[PDB]
Amino acid sequence: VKVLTYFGMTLAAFAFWQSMDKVHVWIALHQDEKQERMEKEAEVRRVRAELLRKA
Amino acid sequence: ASGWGITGNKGRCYDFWMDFSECMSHCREPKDCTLLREDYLECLHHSKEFQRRNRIYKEEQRKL
Amino acid sequence: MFNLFLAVFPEIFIINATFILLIHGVVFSTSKKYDYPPLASNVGWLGLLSVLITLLLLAAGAPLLTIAHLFWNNLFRRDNFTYFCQIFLLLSTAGTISMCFDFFDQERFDAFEFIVLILLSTCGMLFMISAYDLIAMYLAIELQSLCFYVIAASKRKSEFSTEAGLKYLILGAFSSGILLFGCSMIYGSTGATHFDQLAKILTGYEITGARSSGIFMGILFIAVGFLFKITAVPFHMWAPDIYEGSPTPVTAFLSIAPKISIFANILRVFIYGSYGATLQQIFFFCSIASMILGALAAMAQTKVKRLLAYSSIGHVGYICIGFSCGTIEGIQSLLIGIFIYALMTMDAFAIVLALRQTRVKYIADLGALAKTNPILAITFSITMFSYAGIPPLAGFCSKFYLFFAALGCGAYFLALVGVVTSVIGCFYYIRLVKRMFFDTPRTWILYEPMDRNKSLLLAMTSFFITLFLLYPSPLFSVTHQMALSLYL
Amino acid sequence: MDLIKYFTFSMIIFILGIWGILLNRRNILIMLMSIELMLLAVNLNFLVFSVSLDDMMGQVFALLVLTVAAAESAIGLAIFVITFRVRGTIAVEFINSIQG
Amino acid sequence: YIAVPAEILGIILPLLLGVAFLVLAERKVMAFVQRRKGPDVVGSFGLLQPLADGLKLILKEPISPSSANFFLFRMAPVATFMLSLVAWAVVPFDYGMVLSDLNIGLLYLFAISSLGVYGIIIAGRSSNSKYAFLGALRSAAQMVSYEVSIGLILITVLICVGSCNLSEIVMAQKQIWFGIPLFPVLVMFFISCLAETNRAPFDLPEAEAELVAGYNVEYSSMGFALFFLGEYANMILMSGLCTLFFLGGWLPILDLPIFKKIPGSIWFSIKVLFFLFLYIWVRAAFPRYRYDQLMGLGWKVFLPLSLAWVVSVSGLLVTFQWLP
Amino acid sequence: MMLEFAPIFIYLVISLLVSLILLGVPFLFSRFDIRFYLVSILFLIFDLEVTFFFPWAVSLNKIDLFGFWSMMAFLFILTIGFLYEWKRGALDWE
Amino acid sequence: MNTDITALEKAQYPVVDRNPAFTKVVGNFSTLDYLRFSTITGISVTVGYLSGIKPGIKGPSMVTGGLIGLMGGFMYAYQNSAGRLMGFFPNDGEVASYQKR
Amino acid sequence: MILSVLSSLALVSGLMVVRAKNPVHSVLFFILVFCDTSGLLLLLGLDFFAMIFLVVYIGAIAVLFLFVVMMFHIQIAEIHEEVLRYLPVSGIIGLIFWWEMFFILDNESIPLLPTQRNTTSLRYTVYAGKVRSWTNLETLGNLLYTYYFVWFLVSSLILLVAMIGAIVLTMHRT
Ligand SMILES: CCCCCCCCCCCCCCCCCC(=O)OC[C@H](COP(=O)([O-])OCC(O)COP(=O)([O-])OC[C@@H](COC(=O)CCCCCCCCCCCCCCCCC)OC(=O)CCCCCCCCCCCCCCCCC)OC(=O)CCCCCCCCCCCCCCCCC
């Protein structure tokens, strides 16, 4: 490739990695909500299992 | 788990590993060693520590 | 200090003998005085001797192999299971070598390095069986694989042999990279590579909601590498091309020993470890796919080698059904299937090697064999019927267990697939018998009689195949012993 | 964020190897090069984990994996050489005679 | 860090001057052996000759032949020149006189040496000339062959020292210079250095009269000058490495106050000058090997001897417990 | 500490700049020989030998006799390979 | 180097010497050990001779086979003698010699 | 940021490995990838591995690849093909691998979000481990030859296989 082409590809890749950083921050910020959803679903599943075991 | 540290001393998480292994070596149910196991894994990845600190940062960003 | 090394006496001996043979071969193959003699047969006989002495050392020192187990613990683990697996591996290597001398002298394959590479790969498989850590397992697998890559390309002026080697190296390296990635993910997630540590960490949790995706994908990638190694569908297509393109003694060796070694590895990794139902489902689906594809593709084949390759793929499907069901009887049946398939494959390749002296290639080349060599046509027919699983031949055990597990694990689609694929297999196995006994071709091929080594090996394997079910107790007891020794 | 950044670096190398397999159907030399790329990515994975976990096992295995990579490349290039010598060409249409 | 570039320039610029005058010194010594005068017209005693030659080279039009490897053709001399320059970052001239006090400095030098082959290979391939390509292949093979012996000799020194730090390697010779007990190892190292720098009697690229075209035959103007400068800087570096590993670097000959008066940098310089003189002297004294003969020497003589010296030194030091 | 590597990077940048200046100022006014593959293979093997020698050489004071003999066994295997290459003519360029 | 001879499966016979020295094990060689040694070596020499005839190197082939057989037979005899002294193999002779000296 | 720069260089150089029309160019870009990898290793404090990656990957393996590829003199017609028709299959396979495999550590290794507070003061220093620090080299050498010597020797066997195979497959003695 042209030298300038390689440099421009490198700039685009740098932008991609900064975007990936933003994605990682987003994923980290949503740990608590994911835990809450997991807990609510676990409670629902446990209640269903206990209720069906009653019979 | 090996105990060989990268700077020539006992590995950071090796005492937790050994407590967990010694627990499991005589407890016939692994659920009795759950706490020690999650302590070992917390030492490897610091997941709960970082999650709690991120909660603190979140509340700071919410109250500002 | 010296007595600690009693745990590795067998391996030390075979490695040292291999070095001695390498030096002997290179010194006298280059000798002008002796007019550069071919040394493939001389080194082959000396290496058969070395394998038998290794077997003696290992079998007669059963307790001593467990000496200094704490000192050796972070390197390997020797027990009853590894004991019997290694003995079987050495026996298979000895038989395969014994089948090679007519090939050496009549083709004039003079390369003694062939024998050295076989011996080094045997060393690698020995270390594979006793591996008790992901690192050791990978290293031993790689040693074995590199030896196979080289010997698959041994006919270096042949288009077929060079093609086989190229396909093998590329696909083998790819699968090895996938397996190594899985190993790295497991280490990163658990901080451990020793099998004991992995067992302790993974037991009691499997997928308890908060499942380590790192652990789950490490297991998956390792399983993909293992399935490539056992030629399970869809990681199988290397096997038929490599089996056909390699020199026939190479094909015979690849058909048996690596399966024993890798199944020992699979047992000790998965069975002894813990992610669980996911992985048994992996092997379940791959077993069904392997049975179906092997049956159909074998039905398509017109050449003997390709037919045997696809037959082996189908049979590894049958065997993996036992691993899937996850019971002591499942493991025992897997071991019984491996042993019986190995003996049958040795019989079949002894016949194939005998017929390669007249360049057998097509199934139709067997025409009128019941006339030109009646006892050979009968012997080959017994092998085919055993492959088909017709009772009371030894091959019936694998069919019986396949259906026993289908009604034991509770799987009726599996039973239906087994019925259909068994009937397809019987058809393409009895097609060979029809070619040797029923056909009246215009042109016959007259085959040169086999050497003493292959006749004796064929005679013993043919008595075993016909008469095993009269006295099957030792195999049953030893396989139950091994299945139990995995956990106790 | 260090550990996620070090891991995604090695991960892009691994995905690039996979893509090189996918995009090079007429070029098996590049296929070999893509396999080396995957092996390099795995080696990097062991080294990063060794530091993160404060454990030496990742480092021992990394050295041994380098040995395996070297032997693999040597044997693979020998097989490439002999294939080329037999055919006079490296084109994929001359290594497709085994089939079915 | 703001003053780091000043230190780097204080290394690089005097080094380039030293190379320019090493060329002149080679010409002078060669002439004096040959009963003639070298350059003595351009400047007094010929001392302005290097500046004139460099000026001529920069004022020469570049050619850049119509090849399909336009970028690679010009980048190869840049690569070899930069590699010749960067090895000096870890070279200590006296106690504390070093740019980078690398703990892994020995292996770093080995890595730089291993990287040196690419400039020659790429120059040969990119030049679109079968003769240049063949010559480059032969030169590259020779360099990689002698790199093995260089590495094993490095290991021998490392066993004696117990550290890859070049300054520590020097200070471990306070009791005795390593060149005294390991004198055959030093001779082996010097010969391997000759072969590794493509110098006589191993100078294949100089054998145009022998129907062996060099890898840089298609180069003109400053690409050719870059190749030449990198080669001579590497000669100076090999002399410096011989001084560091076996002649005790900046240390005086005898631990006496009379010798300790003169600074360590002067000791180091004098030893380096001795080795450069030996480079020139050897070029003046002997004919050259054929390629096949020197390859045979590399693999059949120097490798076995280097490995044997590794085994003997390690075994002796382990036996009597004299390890560092 | 990795602090000492920073001057090396700045040195590389400066050396590159000097290279560009020197090179850019004048712009103002089908015969495969297997023996090269074989020498490459031999260099690869002994390159890894040196690689494995480095930690051993710095660790001799701690590993004592066991480490010495383990490295000796390593070298014995590799030297058997070298003898094989020597006998087969891989080291002859005539 | 820390060492530990302790085996996974305990010895089923009296332990005359837990970790016998090399020379003690060799001096413990019985007549049966020497018979095993000599048989293995002789078979190996015979195989070397017979397999060496066709290439024309029967002498050197005998030497190579004999080296392999010597090493294997010595390892086998050592295995048996050490296992007897350690109590892993039936060791009536070792126990009798131990209860007297 | 620095890891962003090195990862961008590695990404572009790797794409050049897998997409350059000339295989000699592919080998040269491969060499750039190993240089960037060495930079990462220096960031991790593993200077021995950083140097060994140069010595072995670039100094020996890449040299072997370059010698072989250069003497092959491959014509582009033999290995050319248009890759525009692969964009979808690479899109699905890449994305699935991307979505699964770039984020596999996120649930186990949750990142610490950098806050507007100086956490550097909470770094606890233990001087006991700093009295006699070990290099990466000596930490590795403490283990290779004694506690894990069997794996070391098996690697030697692997290299011996490489030597034998190289001779047997390619040697044509004059
Ligand atoms: C604080 C930092 C400050 C930094 C300041 C410096 C910043 C520089 C910015 C420059 C960007 C703007 C450029 C503006 C335009 C300039 C005008 C112009 O282009 O005319 C130039 C003109 C060619 O321009 P062109 O018109 O574009 O033609 C291009 C092709 O002809 C087209 O033909 P083609 O299509 O057929 O392509 C074939 C291919 C040729 O085939 C190839 O394979 C290309 C070569 C690539 C691999 C070669 C190296 C590996 C080989 C081994 C070498 C030895 C290894 C060991 C020694 C080195 C290791 C340290 O050509 C290419 O692909 C060229 C692509 C270049 C990629 C490689 C360079 C990037 C290296 C990474 C740099 C890292 C820092 C920069 C980034 C910083 C973060 C953003 O001529 C020259 O370039 C002069 C030649 C001298 C070049 C010397 C460069 C160094 C060489 C030696 C070192 C080798 C290793 C590289 C460094 C390694 C670091 C560890």
Ligand SMILES: CCCCCCCCCCCCCCCCCC(=O)OC[C@H](COP(=O)([O-])OCC(O)COP(=O)([O-])OC[C@@H](COC(=O)CCCCCCCCCCCCCCCCC)OC(=O)CCCCCCCCCCCCCCCCC)OC(=O)CCCCCCCCCCCCCCCCC
């Ligand atoms: C304000 C300051 C102003 C002053 C400073 C200004 C400085 C100048 C600007 C910098 C340079 C830009 C211009 C480049 C040179 C153009 C001039 C020219 O003559 O080019 C001729 C060039 C002809 O190619 P050649 O060099 O002569 O080589 C011919 C043969 O191919 C040679 O054969 P070969 O064997 O060597 O190579 C084989 C093959 C090589 O095959 C390839 O290289 C593959 C080509 C496709 C590349 C795909 C993307 C690769 C980059 C990585 C990006 C992340 C990927 C993540 C994927 C993993 C995720 C799962 O060749 C090709 O296919 C050539 C295709 C080149 C197309 C490159 C297109 C790059 C993608 C751009 C996407 C833009 C999206 C922006 C946002 C990105 C998302 C964050 O044609 C072009 O004009 C294309 C180049 C122009 C676009 C590329 C540069 C993009 C830079 C965008 C600006 C940065 C935005 C982000 C800023 C972030 C700030 C925070």
Ligand SMILES: C[C@@H]1CC[C@@]2(OC1)O[C@H]1C[C@H]3[C@@H]4CC=C5C[C@@H](OCCC(CO[C@H]6O[C@H](CO)[C@@H](O[C@H]7O[C@H](CO)[C@@H](O)[C@H](O)[C@H]7O)[C@H](O)[C@H]6O)CO[C@H]6O[C@H](CO)[C@@H](O[C@H]7O[C@H](CO)[C@@H](O)[C@H](O)[C@H]7O)[C@H](O)[C@H]6O)CC[C@]5(C)[C@H]4CC[C@]3(C)[C@H]1[C@@H]2C
């Ligand atoms: C022979 C041939 C030739 C070719 C070749 O070899 C082969 O030649 C070889 C030559 C090689 C180069 C050699 C050298 C380098 C430099 C290196 O670059 C250093 C970067 C490291 C060091 O940087 C700082 O390190 C210290 C700070 O850390 C500074 O100390 C201060 O701070 C102390 C504490 O208060 C005080 O006590 C002190 O008094 C006070 O001075 C110190 O001055 C400074 O140097 C790492 O730093 C980063 O890392 C941080 C962590 O990730 C990042 O943090 C960020 O993320 C965090 C969350 O994660 C957030 O919390 C943060 O807020 C947020 O900022 C951040 O990006 C950044 O700091 C990058 C690699 C490279 C280029 C090599 C490339 C490859 C070669 C070309 C080889 C090539 C192949």
Ligand SMILES: CCCCCCCCCCCCCCCCCC(=O)O[C@@H](COC(=O)CCCCCCCCCCCCCCC)COP(=O)(O)OCC[N+](C)(C)C
């Ligand atoms: C019931 C089982 C389930 C169903 C499967 C049946 C499988 C067979 C299919 C049956 C259909 C008919 C089969 C016909 C075969 C009978 C003919 C036959 O095999 O005769 C052989 C005989 O084949 C054998 O050699 C069989 C030997 C097997 C030995 C088994 C007996 C073990 C104990 C016997 C002890 C020795 C003999 C004692 C008395 C002297 C002769 O072979 P040729 O190739 O004709 O010539 C041989 C060369 N020469 C005569 C010169 C030596």
Ligand SMILES: CCCCCCCCCCCCCCCCCC(=O)O[C@@H](COC(=O)CCCCCCCCCCCCCCC)COP(=O)(O)OC[C@H](O)CO
């Ligand atoms: C080019 C040179 C070739 C050299 C070839 C000759 C040497 C090859 C190596 C042969 C093995 C050792 C032979 C030397 C005998 C003397 C051994 C000795 O002196 O005993 C020492 C112990 O020596 C050993 O035990 C090391 C044996 C080396 C391992 C050789 C491998 C043998 C088989 C291994 C099986 C693993 C499978 C092999 C995989 C391929 C005593 O040390 P220590 O117990 O007092 O303390 C330990 C140490 O000082 C502190 O760390």
Ligand SMILES: CCCCCCCCCCCCCCCCCCCC(=O)O[C@H](COC(=O)CCCCCCCCCCCCCC)COP(=O)(O)OCCN
């Ligand atoms: C279980 C079912 C029932 C089985 C019944 C078993 C009964 C026991 C077997 C009885 C054997 C009867 C025959 C005994 C006399 C034959 C003696 C052979 C004489 C001999 O020296 O043969 C040599 C060849 O070696 C050879 O030919 C021998 C090697 C042949 C292979 C034997 C196995 C070796 C490897 C072990 C494989 C194990 C596989 C298990 C998976 C030379 O012969 P020559 O002088 O005619 O000249 C050949 C031209 N070169």
Ligand SMILES: COC1=C(OC)C(=O)C(C/C=C(\C)CC/C=C(\C)CC/C=C(/C)CC/C=C(\C)CCC=C(C)C)=C(C)C1=O
């Ligand atoms: C006769 O018509 C035709 C087809 O139709 C049979 C075709 O396909 C194609 C071409 C397209 C193909 C062959 C794509 C199919 C490829 C696949 C699925 C890749 C996997 C490879 C193999 C050998 C399949 C093995 C995998 C199986 C059996 C299942 C996977 C595993 C488990 C469930 C555990 C053409 C031209 C065609 O003309």
